Amino acid sequence: SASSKELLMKLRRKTGYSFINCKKALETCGGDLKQAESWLHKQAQKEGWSKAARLHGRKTKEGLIGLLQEGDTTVLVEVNCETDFVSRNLKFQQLVQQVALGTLLHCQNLKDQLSTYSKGFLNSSELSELPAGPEREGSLKDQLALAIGKLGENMILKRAAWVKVPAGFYVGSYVHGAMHSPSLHNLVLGKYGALVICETSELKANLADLGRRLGQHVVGMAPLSVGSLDDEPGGEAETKMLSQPYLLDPSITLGQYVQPHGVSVVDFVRFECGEG
Amino acid sequence: PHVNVGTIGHVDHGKTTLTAAITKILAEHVEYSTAARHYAHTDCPGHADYVKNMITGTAPLDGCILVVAANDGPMPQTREHLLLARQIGVEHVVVYVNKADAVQDSEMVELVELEIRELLTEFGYKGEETPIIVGSALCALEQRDPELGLKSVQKLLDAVDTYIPVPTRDLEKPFLLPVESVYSIPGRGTVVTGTLERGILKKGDECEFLGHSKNIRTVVTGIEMFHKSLDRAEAGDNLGALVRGLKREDLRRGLVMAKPGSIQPHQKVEAQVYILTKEEGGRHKPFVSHFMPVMFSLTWDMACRIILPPGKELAMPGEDLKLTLILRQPMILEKGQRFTLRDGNRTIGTGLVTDTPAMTEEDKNIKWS
């Protein structure tokens, strides 16, 4: 009838679940919208896990790198999916946010030093067992399941990295191929993400550009190690960061570029979505 | 006529099945042909892939076939599927609602169609006139239940033939012929060979060569194709044009023969550019602003300077973006024209002109080699 059709559409517009799921929810709850909706949500998690198991194994080379900086902590996360159509979708991006916040909360509870910076990583397994934010329920593993059920694609919590910095240290960061999404405050998503840990007594308020530039250099030149200021320039094929031809001026090395600013590079993290 | 169509939608919704059903029905990146035209069917896994194809001109789409499953209905990413179509210039879409063919519920399907038309309208398409065909790609492929299988596929094809228009030839535009080679015919005169880029050329039309220090003007006395003397040539045709009162010495490759005073040389351009990965023969490292590669377009080449968008200080291999390029000197660079960028002896990028902005003071102040 027209009345039942209206109820089905109304439940669809309201919740976003599939038409068939909405239809089964309504007939199961006697055509009662409120009950149907509640029913659908309750089934969501189960549906997700089941769907996640079915798609588990499919190639997921696309996705996003997320960068979240809160106070003196910085986290970098990689979440993969099957298509870039999904990596561009807001629902996927919201999942990445939940993964970043989940990582941030976990880190701001770990080792906090005063004399030096702290760094750490998390593999797929470790990131998955992490507690979902105080908003949702269960682990990020459960949130991933929910997203997989909502988008219909296999997805993977690939890895994470975090860094905590006391006074005397500074973190330069850059995300390349950023995606616009103003609803995810402070989070920056893209295809490449880099963190450059520095030691410096200069005020952080005067290092924003330098910080971004060091990050740009790491993304564009992909160094394999920090290297040293004592070593000689290494040409366009150099591996040691400090000896590499500076990205925005090959005439000088990265070390020669940064030294004058009263900043020394002591470590870095480079995430490229879908690498290895 | 040749038409390019691409299938967009969730992979589990039937795309590949439909594409196969169409293949088997017409047997009585793929290619098939209906009564009306020749079809080039494409089904790329992603957004970046379609954009790359558009820029490179490899598979410029004239329309899309959006495949949606009746049970799930539109997915959240369906939004990005339509944003992509809108972005690469597709203005016509045909929809195929694929169902569990279990003769389910006509009302549900109706709501699916309704939602789809709401979406189409939302993204600029005319959702009310968009052809939406309902059926089962699986039945059509397995030669079963013709009412839902065969019938729906035949209706889809008819809808594609009618709603997706053929690619324009631009025959309304002034003719433009990039000179590929020059030679003489004993007793007849000088001939320039090349392939018309747009418009129409008729034996007798006045012409004008551009790209030469001096502006040359004359008349086309004869058209030659396959050693046959014609009186008319069309955009896309490779021909030989007999020029009046001119010697081989006065012409060369790189010049452009066009309708008198119809083209205006350009030195500044904004374009969509795809940067080649190392695997595709491109660079290993990224390039930054003021990078000076050589632009190759039509039958000419010229040095140019790349200007990254404000904010961006680098561009990575495998990426596409909008860039501003400044030629060392004006050349025949039209909107819609494609080009390549070479550094040394290798191509590092491909482009498609989007605008021909007026050269600014700053651009004039550029310091070259």
Swiss-Prot record, chain A:
This entry's Gene Ontology molecular function terms read: translation elongation factor activity
Keywords from the named record: Elongation factor, Mitochondrion, Phosphoprotein, Protein biosynthesis, Transit peptide
Cellular component GO terms, alphabetical: mitochondrial matrix
Which cysteine-cysteine pairs are annotated as disulfide bonds in the entry? none
The PTM Phosphoserine maps to S228
Where does this protein have coiled-coil stretches? none
Q: Where in the cell is it found?
A: Mitochondrion
Residues found modified as N6-succinyllysine: K34, K91, K150
By what name is this protein known?
Elongation factor Ts, mitochondrial
**Classification lineage:** Eukaryota, Metazoa, Chordata, Craniata, Vertebrata
> Which gene is annotated as encoding this protein in its UniProt record?
TSFM
Curated annotation (Swiss-Prot), chain B:
* Positions where N6-acetyllysine occurs in the chain: K24, K173, K278, K335
GO terms under cellular component: mitochondrial inner membrane; mitochondrial matrix; mitochondrion
UniProt region (G4), positions on chain: 98-101
Query: Cross-referenced InterPro entries, in alphabetical order?
Result: EF-Tu_GTP-bd, EF-Tu_GTPase, EFTu-like_2, EFTU_2, G_TR_CS, P-loop_NTPase, T_Tr_GTP-bd_dom, Transl_B-barrel_sf
UniProt binding sites for Mg(2+): T16
Q: Which CDD domains match?
A: EF_Tu, EFTU_II, mtEFTU_III
Q: Where in the cell is it found?
A: Mitochondrion
Q: Which residues carry this modification: Phosphoserine?
A: S229
Q: Which residues cross the membrane?
A: none
Q: Where is this region: G1?
A: 9-16
State the top-level EC class.
Answer: hydrolase
For this UniProt entry, the molecular function terms from Gene Ontology, in alphabetical order, are: GTP binding; GTPase activity; magnesium ion binding; translation elongation factor activity
Which terms are listed as keywords in the entry?
Acetylation, Elongation factor, GTP-binding, Hydrolase, Magnesium, Metal-binding, Mitochondrion, Nucleotide-binding, Phosphoprotein, Protein biosynthesis, Transit peptide
Q: Quote the EC number.
A: 3.6.5.3
**What is the recorded name of this protein?**
Elongation factor Tu, mitochondrial
Identify the species of origin. Bos taurus (Bovine)
